[PDB]
Amino acid sequence: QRTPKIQVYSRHPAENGKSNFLNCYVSGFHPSDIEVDLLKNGERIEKVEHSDLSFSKDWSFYLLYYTEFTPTEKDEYACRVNHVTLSQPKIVKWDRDM
Amino acid sequence: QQVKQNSPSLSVQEGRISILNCDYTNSMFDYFLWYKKYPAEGPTFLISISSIKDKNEDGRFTVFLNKSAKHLSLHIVPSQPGDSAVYFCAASVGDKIIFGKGTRLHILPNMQNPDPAVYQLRDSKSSDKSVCLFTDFDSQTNVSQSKDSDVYITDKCVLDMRSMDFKSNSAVAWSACANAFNNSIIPEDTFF
Amino acid sequence: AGVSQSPSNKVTEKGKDVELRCDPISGHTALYWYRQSLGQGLEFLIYFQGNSAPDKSGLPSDRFSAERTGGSVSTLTIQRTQQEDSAVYLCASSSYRGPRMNEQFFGPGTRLTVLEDLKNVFPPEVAVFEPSEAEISHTQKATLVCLATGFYPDHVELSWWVNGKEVHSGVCTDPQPLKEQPALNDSRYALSSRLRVSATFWQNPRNHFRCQVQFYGLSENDEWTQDRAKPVTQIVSAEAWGRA
Amino acid sequence: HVSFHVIQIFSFVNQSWARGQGSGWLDELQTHGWDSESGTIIFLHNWSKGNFSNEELSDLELLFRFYLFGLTREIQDHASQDYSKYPFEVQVKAGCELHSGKSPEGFFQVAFNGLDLLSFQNTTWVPSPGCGSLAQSVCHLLNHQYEGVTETVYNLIRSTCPRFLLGLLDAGKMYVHRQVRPEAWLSSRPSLGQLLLVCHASGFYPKPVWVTWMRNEQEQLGTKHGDILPNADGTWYLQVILEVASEAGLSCRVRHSSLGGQDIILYWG
Ligand SMILES: CCCCCCCCCCCCCCCC(=O)OC[C@H](O)CO
Ligand SMILES: *[C@@H]1O[C@H](CO)[C@@H](O)[C@H](O)[C@H]1NC(C)=O
Ligand SMILES: CCCCCCCCCC
Ligand SMILES: CCCCCCCCCC
Ligand SMILES: [K+]
Ligand SMILES: [K+]
Ligand SMILES: [K+]
């Protein structure tokens, strides 16, 4: 029973009012049952795509959640993960850097 | 047809090699099997080979597998009377099993020196009813069919594959005995 | 008990519905259905991987349908039977356990025969022709001849019995029957066999020779209405006792 | 050092419910998917059919479906004895490894609940050392009861797999050996625990890359070095942080195979 690692990052440099892609990379978890949500401002983004579930040499799982997004000032994005190894859903915020 | 057994029939002398051949087209076949089928019975498993191997021997039976040629071959040595049956090759991938159209192997039995003759036989109950019997003719002898529709002539019979004595070639004609088998090539050594 | 099939043989009139049963080996996950037409090899019909049919492609028409609700015993139904449906329907089962991948176990088969009408079905007339005295004098052998005549359809099983026991030595029967009127479609058949014995055996009067012919025709549960005995599946025999 | 492998993730939840996931992989590059509903392969690329025909791939799917039938059936059948085992996961990684001049290796690895259970070595199933009482149990079944499926597994991983792989590596040589230039940028965040300068490099392919912070010609030991992370493109992402006193002679150097000797140098202002 292993804990998920959550990493949030953008596909291209984030320019306010320019479409991009927000990635949430969930790795090193076991069992495979996971619930991953990309949040716009605490609200769940609906058109979220993801890669096919896969696993590492140690048999722990990994998966990529991605969404097309247009960033702006005062628009704070995050990734919310619920797994058996987590008491409460874990939220990793996306650091848009000013 | 992904499994092809060209040569629908074969004739081999008792005591000699019987080679049944088969060709497959599917590169994905991983197992090849052979089945023997007797008339009025369902096919029975005979011998198999995995595509890992190229030869499999079990008694008088050998399978050969050439994966380059996509050829599969069965060898019966020596062949005996009970080997007369239809032979099917099968090839499989997963649970898909493709069967060939079969080969009827006829094992011609070994028998004594010929003494060709034609005999008239009378029925047990009805004495009037007569039957002609052409018997004890050479292996290479051909029985030609009846010209007249009121006269019936049978082709050379098939000896019981469990027969162990009194092995002899014969044909029967029914409707006079002498001129009955004339349509067929009867030797000069024939007895009357 | 191995793989079994019901009925062993069925003779039907065109238009009737026919059901064929298969009892595979207990445990065997795969059940296959094939048919063998006279002048053809093994024609695949359908198979079952459990109680579901993955390949329902060999089915010759919409009338043909199969089921393995079990998935153990499977049935093949043929609606409104036609002359082209006449074949030996074979069934087989297999397991994925074991040393052989896809070693199938075949049932004995169901011979299906669909006729325009049953009025043409006839049992054979079996006669035994005693050995020629010209043969005993020349070879010191004695050939008995058996003749089954005027039977329809072409399927019969011939056997020779000497003193209550079945014999194979000196036996030879024709591989296929003979068409009496070969030009006619409704041609009745004939089949011959011989029994070669020693002069010394035949010449005993206490030796009993019987030629048995199993004919496959109609069933007891059949709608026969004719001024002639019903041509049911029956053994028709002819006998002979040794001369001196 | 070129390989192909499929992965299967079986989740056995209850006596009446079990789900499977599957994929094809050319090293860390997904080439195939699996539609569990129809039981067919998903060709992720124009070249992911390799040099196999549609009749050859059709038969691989038929073979895969058959294995899923028998596997799921047998597991549920044996688990229909003790239900405290439920829920449990089964993971399979099977494939082939190709070597220069050497005969190709084949591998089939099984893990029960995120722990190695079995291995197929030569012509025989081997249980995992120590971990597993089940390993010895299941290896006994496979070696004694399933000899037939074992020899179709042997053939698959040692004959079908290399044949497939070689034709796939030939079909997709241009994509697999493509070179994509990285897009690089600088950003700054306040240091929660001083300021944090972040250097990003993204959309580069292949995976090997080097991101360094410089002060003129001198390399500067980074504060935190990221992991190379995926992008949906098939490309990669990497970030390197440098903690500095606020507000000046600092550049970031991105080094990648695609850039042909010259490195991308990014200056801060
Ligand atoms: C063994 C290697 C032989 C190489 C030749 C094959 C090339 C195509 C492979 C891609 C399909 C991957 C899918 C297989 C995984 C799979 O089907 O199992 C889980 C299911 O989702 C359970 O429902
Ligand atoms: C099996 O699990 C599925 C998913 O949780 C559920 O829908 C189903 O009702 C469960 N059945 C039992 C018997 O627990
Ligand atoms: C195709 C058959 C799959 C092999 C069955 C393996 C049985 C393991 C269950 C304990
Ligand atoms: C308890 C389930 C473990 C089964 C392992 C699967 C073996 C793979 C052989 C095809
Ligand atoms: K078997
Ligand atoms: K970092
Ligand atoms: K992307």
Quote the Cα angle for B135-B139-B143, to 5°.
Answer: 60
Q: Into how many domains does chain B fold?
A: 2
Choose the residue to mutate in D11, D12, D13, D80 for probing ligand 2, maximizing ligand atoms within 8 Å of C-beta. D13
For residue B43, list chain C residues with Cβ-Cβ distance below 8 A.
42, 90, 92, 104, 106
D66 lines ligand 2 (CB under 6 A): no
Strands B158-159 and B130-135: unpaired
Resolution of the model in angstroms: 3.0
What is the distance between the alpha carbons of residues D230 and D209, in angstroms, rounded to a whole number? Answer: 13
D105 and D76 belong to one structural domain:
yes
Q: Which two tokens stand for residue B140?
A: 């290479």
D215 and D142 belong to one structural domain:
no
Q: Which two tokens stand for residue D84?
A: 């405290």
Asked how this structure was determined, the answer is X-ray
CB C102 within 8 A of CB C36: no
For residue C101, list chain B residues with Cβ-Cβ distance below 8 A.
30-31, 50, 92
CA-based torsion, D225, D227, D231, D233: positive or negative: positive
* CA distance to partner chain D, nearest, from residue B26 (Å): 7
Among residues B82, B109, B136, the one where a domain terminates is B109
CB B78 within 8 A of CB B60: yes
Among residues D131, D152, D177, the one where a domain terminates is D177
Which residues touch D66 (CB under 8 Å, ≥6 apart)?
B94, B95, C49, C96
Kindly provide the b/e burial profile for residues D209-241, where b requires at least 16 CB atoms within 10 angstroms of the residue's own CB: bebbbbeeeeebebeeebeebbbeebbbbbbbb
Q: Into how many domains does chain D fold?
A: 2
CB D149 within 8 A of CB D68: no
Residues spanned by the domain of D201: 178-269
Q: What residue spans define the domains of chain A? A: 1-98
D110 and D194 belong to one structural domain:
no
For residue D65, list chain C residues with Cβ-Cβ distance below 8 A.
54
B131 and B104 belong to one structural domain:
no
Position D247, amino acid? E
CB A77 within 8 A of CB A40: yes
Nearest ligand (C-alpha, residue D14)? 2
What is the distance between the alpha carbons of residues D178 and B167, in angstroms, rounded to a whole number? Answer: 78
Residue with the smallest CA separation from ligand 1 atom 16 is: D22
8 Å CB contact of D116 and A59:
yes
- Reduced to 3 DSSP states, what percent helix, strand and coil does chain D have, rounded to the nearest 5? 25, 45, 30
B5 and B69 belong to one structural domain:
yes
8 Å CB contact of C194 and B152:
no
What size, in residues, is chain A?
Answer: 98
What is the distance between the alpha carbons of residues D186 and D250, in angstroms, rounded to a whole number? Answer: 11
D182 and D169 belong to one structural domain:
no
Domains and CATH numbers, chain C: 1-116 (2.60.40.10), 117-244 (2.60.40.10)
- On whether any CB of chain C is under 8 Å from the CB of D152, the answer is yes
D17 lines ligand 2 (CB under 6 A): yes
B7 and B91 belong to one structural domain:
yes
D172 and D182 belong to one structural domain:
no
What are phi and psi for residue C17, nearest 5 degrees?
Answer: -100, 140
Helix or strand holding residue D164 (H, E) = helix D161-171
Residue with the smallest CA separation from ligand 1 atom 21 is: D21
Q: Which two tokens stand for residue B26?
A: 């599917």
B154 and B122 belong to one structural domain:
yes
Please report all neighbours of D, defined by 3+ CB atom pairs within 8 A: A, B, C
Q: Which two tokens stand for residue C190?
A: 């004939």
Residue with the smallest CA separation from ligand 3 atom 6 is: D71
- DSSP-assigned states of every residue in chain C: ---EEE-SEEEEETT--EEEEEE--TT--EEEEEEE-TT--EEEEEEEETTEEEE--S--STTEEEE-SSSSSEEEEESS--GGG-EEEEEEEE-SSSSSTT--EE---EEEEEES-GGG-B--EEEEEEPPHHHHHHHSEEEEEEEEEEEBSS-EEEEEEETTEE--TTEEE-SS-EESSTT-TT--EEEEEEEEEEHHHHT-TT-EEEEEEEE--B-TTS---SSS---BSEEEEEEEE---
The neighbour count for residue B129, using CB atoms within 10 Å, is 15
8 Å CB contact of D7 and A55:
yes
Among residues D177, D202, D222, the one where a domain terminates is D177
What is the distance between the alpha carbons of residues B49 and B51, in angstroms, rounded to a whole number? Answer: 7
Among residues D129, D160, D177, the one where a domain terminates is D177
Count of CA atoms in the C-beta half-sphere (13 A) of D147? 7
CA-based torsion, C49, C54, C55, C59: positive or negative: positive
Count of CA atoms in the C-beta half-sphere (13 A) of D33? 11
Q: Which residue has the tokens 């539609």?
A: D35
Position C92, amino acid? A
Q: Which residues pair with B133 in a beta bridge?
A: B119, B172
D146 and D200 belong to one structural domain:
no
D71 lines ligand 3 (CB under 6 A): yes
D183 and D173 belong to one structural domain:
no
State CA D226 to chain mean position distance: 20
Position B5, amino acid? Q
D137 and D71 belong to one structural domain:
yes
The neighbour count for residue B162, using CB atoms within 10 Å, is 12
Choose the residue to mutate in D92, D120, D150 for probing ligand 4, maximizing ligand atoms within 8 Å of C-beta. D92
8 Å CB contact of B157 and C172:
yes
D137 and D230 belong to one structural domain:
no
Position A86, amino acid? L
CB C10 within 8 A of CB C18: yes
Strands B103-108 and B9-13: parallel
For residue B51, list chain D residues with Cβ-Cβ distance below 8 A.
155, 159
8 Å CB contact of D60 and B27:
no
Residues spanned by the domain of B78: 1-109
The neighbour count for residue C137, using CB atoms within 10 Å, is 9
Ligand 3 centroid, distance to D74 Cα (angstroms): 5
* CA distance to partner chain C, nearest, from residue D73 (Å): 10
- Taking one residue from B and the other from C, the number of pairs with CB-CB distance under 8 angstroms is 168
> What are the helix and strand counts (H, E) for chain B?
0, 16
CB A6 within 8 A of CB A95: no
Q: Which residues pair with C30 in a beta bridge?
A: C49, C94
Closest C-alpha among D20, D22, D23 to residue D11: D20
Q: Is D66 helix (H, G, I), strand (E, B) or coil?
A: helix
Class of domain A1-98: mainly beta
Ligand 1 centroid, distance to D41 Cα (angstroms): 7
